[PDB]
Design a binder for these strands. Structure first.
Lengths: 38, 176, 141, 286
RNA sequence: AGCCAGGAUGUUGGCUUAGAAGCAGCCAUCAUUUAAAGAAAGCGUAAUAGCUCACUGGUCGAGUCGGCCUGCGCGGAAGAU
């Protein structure tokens, strides 16, 4: 999970759910599109 | 809501034991009980079960919205069951069932034979296909996902242990 | 006719026996002997002077079967068969070269009227005027 | 002796990819780790191997009880393989004359001169399991230089008359030149094989395809590595036709006034081209 | 929002045609049928076969959706007996 202050909804099918409070964004086929902070 | 427009119809062959918050479902081949939270108002009204969110816990529409989906699965799981098949794609990798134990030909210097708990009648038609049978929807995944986590799908060959319906995304080397 | 299994209309000039690589996949969909589609159409291909893309459609069936529908060549390539060059659309509304009147357009529409139930005479007339303006062609009668 | 090593899969994979007709003979006993027996099906005997020794036992026993039916359904396909090899075994597959170990190979050996079936054998080289088994088929399923069509020298340019010469010692001498290695002792060396005839030591062996004269020096045999001087080369040995002045790929090694070959087929093309450069300017001289 | 569900089909959409064949990119950017379809969004990809968006055409049978303004909240937030 890459970390950066900006979670920008980047991939076309990008889920966003708030697990534990810190946002981590869920793609389907792209592992590269998953950030976690912010 | 959609969940409030979703009542569940218990059929004949599965008995409920409504001691208020604690419901123990006497079914076909097991006992699928869940001790829910106090954000629910349960009533097996006539035959079709009706539920309700308790006051104070107005977020119990969520907490019983779990429950409406829950008990529907329980009355159909204790009778019919889940076929949870896994596909072993590994070079020299086999699967064979004995009693309640599964072998794991997993490319190690030592064998891994793990015993599997109750609510499991496992089978193996061949070395690469493995049945799992169960009554709870949780236990039919939890014992399945532990095997898959021992050898995850490798996205350079397609190697690994993977589900029947799961479709991996294998890549290409592209350098050497 | 059929449904979500397969329906693509792709065939180009039938002087070439071997399936051209991009056409290949529309024959590479439901398991054909590619010699069969070469031997089906050549009994009627000897009634033409080759050079224009003639279209066929593919449509499939359960076991190993298939079927196909023969029509006439479309008027879009018939616009640029008479005009000499096969590709004229470089600038649509800035080129004024080349005239054919409506009388040529209806006699290449009777061969559509004797073949197909859509692509009717009077409705296609503005689109056979519409494929003229995109190519940069003029029309007068 | 490996995982995923199914014997019956691979021989029945040839009929799908290679498209050939293999009928295997020596089958498998053991679950690849406790593997002890190789199932020869003609004599219907399993062979014991070494506990872990580099080569003690050869103990033949019967078919074990754990494979009493797979030996049944596979032996009946072995004895099929002579009724459709020769036409004469067709009427005793069905009539029921006994298909012995010795009778069936007399048809199948003639099925190696046309090569429609190949003979397969499972076992281990490194675990010493099968190597002592694999030798007896070579004298009975691989052809001899006197059982084959021998040296066939055609002519030169006059007429196409292919002439089967004799495989014995009663012919003009004949050999071929291949695997022509080098050495810092004598220079050029060969790994040549003589098909028939006997040569003495010291001869005016020519190379009759390229019109050159050579003389036959001190011939040396090997254990693939060690110099052993072979003086008298008999018909069928493989040695080093030493001291050839010029020699090409596959020309004759033959006395004059004799039959003559002129044959070079499938000259290859080395494709990848890299340019070597010297280190010092004294190096490019060498 | 999901299961059935056609992805109605003129066309090869040029150019330059080697494939730039709706899926590389610049100019057009009409539509034969319009109760469902654009000379077009990605993946499959040299091109396409596979899978969709397009209208949800038929079922559920009620609410639902994208942004503007504020009350507060979370992440951002790592230091040295």
């Amino acid at each position: 999970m890459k970390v950066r202050a900006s979670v920008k909804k980047l991939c076309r099918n990008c889920k966003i759910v708030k697990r534990d409070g810190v946002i981590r964004v869920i793609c389907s086929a792209e592992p590269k599109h998953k950030q976690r902070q912010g | 809501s959609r969940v409030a427009k979703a009542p569940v119809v218990v059929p004949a062959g599965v008995d409920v034991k409504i001691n208020g918050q604690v419901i123990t479902i006497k079914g076909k081949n097991g006992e699928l009980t869940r001790t829910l939270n106090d954000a629910v108002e349960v009533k097996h009204a006539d035959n079709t079960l009706t539920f309700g969110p308790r006051d104070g816990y107005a977020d119990g529409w969520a907490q019983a919205g779990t429950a409406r989906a829950l008990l529907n699965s329980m009355v159909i799981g204790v009778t019919e069951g889940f076929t949870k098949k896994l596909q072993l794609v590994g070079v020299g990798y086999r699967a064979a069932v004995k009693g309640n134990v599964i072998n794991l030909s997993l490319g190690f210097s030592h064998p891994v034979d793990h015993q599997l708990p109750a609510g499991i009648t496992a089978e193996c038609p061949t070395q690469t296909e493995i049945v799992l049978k169960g009554a709870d929807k949780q236990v039919i995944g939890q014992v399945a996902a532990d095997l898959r986590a021992y050898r995850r799908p490798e996205p350079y060959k397609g190697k690994g242990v993977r589900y029947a319906d799961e479709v991996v995304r294998t890549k290409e080397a592209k350098k050497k | 006719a059929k449904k979500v299994q397969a329906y693509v209309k792709l065939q180009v000039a039938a002087g070439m026996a071997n399936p051209s690589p991009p056409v290949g996949p529309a024959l590479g969909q439901q398991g054909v002997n590619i010699m069969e589609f070469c031997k089906a159409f050549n009994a009627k291909t000897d009634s033409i002077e080759k050079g224009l893309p003639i279209p066929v459609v593919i449509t499939v069936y359960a076991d190993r079967s298939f079927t196909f529908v023969t029509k006439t060549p479309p008027a879009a390539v018939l616009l640029k068969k008479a005009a000499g060059i096969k590709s004229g659309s470089g600038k649509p509304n800035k080129d004024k070269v080349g005239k054919i009147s409506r009388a040529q357009l209806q006699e290449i529409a009777q061969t559509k009227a004797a073949d197909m139930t859509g692509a009717d005479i009077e409705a296609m007339t503005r689109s056979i005027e519409g494929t003229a303006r995109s190519m940069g062609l003029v029309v007068e009668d | 002796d490996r995982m995923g090593a199914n014997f019956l899969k691979v021989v029945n994979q040839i009929k799908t990819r290679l498209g050939a007709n293999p009928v295997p003979l020596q089958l498998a006993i053991g679950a690849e780790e406790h593997f002890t027996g190789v199932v020869d099906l003609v004599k219907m005997k399993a062979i014991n191997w070494n506990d872990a020794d580099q080569g003690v036992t050869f103990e033949y026993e019967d078919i074990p009880a754990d494979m009493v039916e797979l030996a049944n359904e596979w032996h009946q396909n072995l004895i099929e393989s002579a009724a459709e090899a020769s036409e004469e075994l067709m009427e005793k597959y069905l009539g029921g004359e006994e298909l012995t170990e010795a009778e069936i190979k007399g048809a199948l050996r003639q099925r190696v001169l046309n090569n429609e079936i190949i003979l397969v054998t499972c076992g281990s080289a490194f675990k010493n399991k099968g190597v002592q088994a694999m030798l007896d088929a070579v004298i009975d399923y691989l052809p001899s230089p006197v059982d084959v069509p021998a040296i066939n020298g055609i002519l030169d340019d006059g007429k196409d008359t292919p002439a089967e010469r004799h495989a014995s010692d009663d012919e003009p001498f004949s050999a071929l030149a291949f695997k022509i290695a080098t050495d810092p002792f004598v220079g050029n060396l060969t790994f040549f094989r003589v098909y028939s005839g006997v040569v003495n030591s010291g001869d005016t062996v020519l190379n009759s395809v390229k019109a050159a004269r050579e003389r036959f020096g001190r011939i040396v045999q090997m254990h693939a590595n060690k110099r052993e001087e072979i003086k008298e080369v008999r018909a069928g040995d493989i040695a080093a036709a030493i001291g050839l002045k010029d020699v090409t790929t596959g020309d004759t090694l033959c006395d004059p006034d004799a039959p003559i070959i002129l044959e070079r087929m499938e000259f290859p093309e080395p494709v990848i081209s890299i340019a070597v450069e010297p280190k010092t300017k004294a190096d490019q001289e060498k």
